[PDB]
């Protein structure tokens, strides 16, 4: 269906000694393909998916200089925002940014986004039209004016609708063996007697890609939420994901309950019964 390319930055000041920790990660959909960590030995943008390793040294040089340049901007901004908020230099603080673009099934631009945060809260974000900014407070508003006087939004728009979409198409083509392949969830159900009268049924979805999935328990055809638990979707560690959902039921009544699995890799939804 649709695809996305996204970058996640995090900077964390370290008042005890030296400069901030800076970490960048790049994804295509739910696959990480590059990383930079200021604590790492390389000091390079590094590959994390086989299909990106084919890019030449030029690609690696540009991306490395640019992330490092960005890390330096974060260092500066950490200092400035400390000022905006009138905070002591003794405290560690955090800046985060996520940006990216979406394309549709035909590979056409769908939307772009770029929002950042300070200490885990919205700071400044690019509006959906990619022309103006949303400031969460008067600190961010100070940045907004400065950025509107310099038309920062235009460069972001030009990238999000242009450069970003083109590279996304390229990666999708080069890594099509994996990026354009779905792994449906491998499902099954387990049965844990809690007593002579009650049992917990757990519905498993394993080794699926991409991460988005819907797991639901039904009782006699109708959705149930009472006496259910639903863990957060988690990484298996091999590029795929896991999830489960469980329900407590009266013993002997297991056959009333069905688990329903929706996923892009499933042409028709799955329904499991014990």
């Amino acid at each position: 269906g649709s695809h996305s390319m996204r970058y996640f930055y995090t900077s964390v000041s370290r008042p005890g000694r030296g400069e901030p920790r800076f970490i960048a990660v790049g994804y295509v959909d739910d696959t990480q393909f590059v990383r930079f960590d200021s604590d790492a030995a390389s000091q390079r943008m590094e590959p994390r998916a086989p299909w990106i390793e084919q890019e030449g040294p030029e690609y690696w040089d540009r991306n490395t200089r640019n992330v490092k340049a960005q890390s330096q901007t974060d260092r500066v901004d950490l200092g400035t925002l400390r000022g905006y908020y009138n905070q002591s230099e003794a405290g560690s603080h955090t800046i985060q940014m996520m940006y990216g673009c979406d394309v549709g099934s035909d590979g056409r631009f769908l939307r772009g986004y770029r929002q950042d945060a300070y200490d885990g809260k919205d700071y400044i974000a690019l509006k959906e039209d990619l022309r103006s900014w949303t400031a969460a407070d008067m600190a961010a508003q100070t940045t907004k004016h400065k950025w509107e006087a310099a038309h920062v939004a235009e460069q972001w728009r030009a990238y999000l609708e242009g450069t970003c979409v083109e590279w996304l198409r390229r990666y999708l083509e080069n890594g099509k063996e994996t990026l354009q392949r779905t792994d449906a969830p491998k499902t099954h159900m387990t049965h844990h007697a809690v007593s002579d009268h009650e049992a917990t049924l757990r519905c498993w979805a394993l080794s699926f890609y991409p991460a988005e999935i819907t797991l639901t328990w039904q009782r006699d055809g109708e959705d149930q939420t009472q006496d259910t638990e639903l863990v957060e979707t988690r990484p298996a560690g091999d590029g795929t994901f896991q999830k489960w959902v469980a329900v407590v039921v009266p013993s002997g009544q297991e056959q009333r309950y069905t688990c329903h699995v929706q996923h892009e890799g499933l042409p028709k939804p799955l329904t499991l019964r014990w």
Partner: peptide
Amino acid sequence: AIFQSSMTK
């Protein structure tokens, strides 16, 4: 590929 500029806040 990453975004190339980096105006300060």
